[PDB]
Design a binder for this molecule. Structure first.
Ligand code: PR
Ligand code: PR
Ligand code: PR
Ligand code: PR
Lengths: 369, 104
């Protein structure tokens, strides 16, 4: 006996592990035609075309299994499947909540649910901050604040400016006495790094500028979207303990398929839901880079890029109708089962061969064959 | 459910392909920002306009997709309208350029 809310995770994991990119719903013909489009700039049409068409078609071959799926597409597919178009739209516009340092809010809100009659889908965004890397020493006679490169710190003799990536000029505070002390303390190189125990008065002048900046990090916003993932806590049967399951892809590392094939979903679930929120909170609180990299690798990396600058965790939560979600997955497998094939691997091979025929034909219609 | 989900993911793959092609094409703009200025015009184009200027810098795919999207990608289902394609071309062009010039 298994709850319907749990069958949702079963079908979802089973379909992704077996069929991969086919779970997006994209017809193989559409996908091959497109691949031909993003590969036709690289084709010099003064050379041999059947050379390049076959080469390009063959390069996309050894890539299908390569991690070219983004965390957002996986997270979006999951929300769409478990919620349907209407509720995924409203879920997409719901505002993210910032995680508490110990995760008290997410912990507490889960406790307000009956683990046997409620099915939660949690979606997280992880944000990195991107402070400037470079300190540029320049003179007033060479510095127009509109010309200068962005996302840099600029040390003048009478000012110390920070130019963010958007264009807004910021005065970092040091008086005109302080700036000349730093200007005459730093050498002749055009650029310098804001990241690297000081020994030379050059190093002290750079480290204090880092300090003068970091005490006013408040005034800026460097944060960029870094990683996306979801978590599903289905219903339990009676006296059964609650279980969560993380879902994610990671561009460059693994797909949503690879994540399932490696059973990392099941590996992280066994550590329990609350202990997960805890290690998730430390990632947003810690300032130690080894600890921030320890957790980040354990949670969000392949089963089988040092996170130096801080990370923050935000979430939004909703409830699943397992009947709807199974119906949504049924319609998706209906599409999948329109591809000839004795078994899932046979159906994937038909998708790939079908897509390759569309990529080759679309290349030929564009290059006069 | 499935048709709406498929149309979404088909539209997403197109946007991704638009972003990759336009970006590769933007990487070779001169110091007069010709290709970028062209990209800005595109994000403000009238959706009823059925003609590009004769020696348009825009990538071949973009203009083919704009004019006859169902000839440009003859596997694309009819439930994707020419207007929907064109709205997507402008929203992608607006997002790329603002990212390219670092406002997002
Ligand atoms: Pr067979
Ligand atoms: Pr076979
Ligand atoms: Pr304009
Ligand atoms: Pr304008």
């Amino acid at each position: 006996l298994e709850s319907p809310g749990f069958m949702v995770h079963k079908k979802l994991k089973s379909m992704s592990q077996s069929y991969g990119v086919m779970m997006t719903g994209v017809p193989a013909e559409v996908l091959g035609q497109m691949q031909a489009e993003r590969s036709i700039p690289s084709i010099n049409k003064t050379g041999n075309l059947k050379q390049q068409i076959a080469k390009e078609v063959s390069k996309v071959c050894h890539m299908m299994t390569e991690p070219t799926q983004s965390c957002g597409q996986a997270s979006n597919d999951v929300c769409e499947l478990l919620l349907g178009k209407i509720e995924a739209e409203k879920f997409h516009f719901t505002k993210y909540e910032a995680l508490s340092a110990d995760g008290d809010n997410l912990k507490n809100v889960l406790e307000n649910t009956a683990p046997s009659s409620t099915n939660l889908l949690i979606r997280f965004e992880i944000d990195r901050e991107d402070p400037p890397i470079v300190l540029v020493k320049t003179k007033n006679e060479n510095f127009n604040p509109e010309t200068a490169v962005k996302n840099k710190i600029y040390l003048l003799e009478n000012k110390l400016y920070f130019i963010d990536k958007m264009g807004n000029l910021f005065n970092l505070g040091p008086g005109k006495k302080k700036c000349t002390q730093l200007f005459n303390a730093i050498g002749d190189s055009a650029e310098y790094s804001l990241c690297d125990e000081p020994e030379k008065p050059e190093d002290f002048a750079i480290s204090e500028i880092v300090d003068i900046f970091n005490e006013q990090k408040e005034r800026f916003d460097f944060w960029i979207g870094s990683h996306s993932f979801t978590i599903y806590i289905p219903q339990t049967l009676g006296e059964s303990p609650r279980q969560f399951y993380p879902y994610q892809a990671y561009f460059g590392s693994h797909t949503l398929q690879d994540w399932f094939v490696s059973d990392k979903d099941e590996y992280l679930s066994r550590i329990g839901i609350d202990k997960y929120i805890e290690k998730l909170a430390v990632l947003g609180k810690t300032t130690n880079t080894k600890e921030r990299s320890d957790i980040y690798a354990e949670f969000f990396s392949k089963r089988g890029n040092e996170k130096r600058q801080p990370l923050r965790v935000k979430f939004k939560i909703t409830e699943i109708n397992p009947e709807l979600a199974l119906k949504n997955l049924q319609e998706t497998q209906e599409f999948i089962d329109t591809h000839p094939g004795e078994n899932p691997s046979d159906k994937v091979e038909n998708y790939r061969n079908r897509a390759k025929l569309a990529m080759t034909e679309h290349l030929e219609s564009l290059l006069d064959i | 459910f499935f048709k709406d989900y498929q149309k979404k993911n088909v539209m997403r793959l197109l946007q991704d392909s638009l972003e990759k092609i336009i970006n590769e094409w933007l990487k070779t703009d001169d110091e007069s920002h010709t290709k970028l200025k062209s990209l800005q015009e595109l994000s403000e184009m009238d959706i009823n306009a059925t003609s590009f200027a004769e020696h348009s810098p825009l990538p071949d795919f973009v203009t083919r997709l704009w004019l006859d999207p169902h000839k440009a990608l003859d596997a694309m289902d009819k439930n994707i309208s020419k207007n929907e394609i064109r709205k997507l071309i402008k929203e992608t062009a607006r997002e790329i350029e603002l990212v390219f010039t670092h406002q997002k």
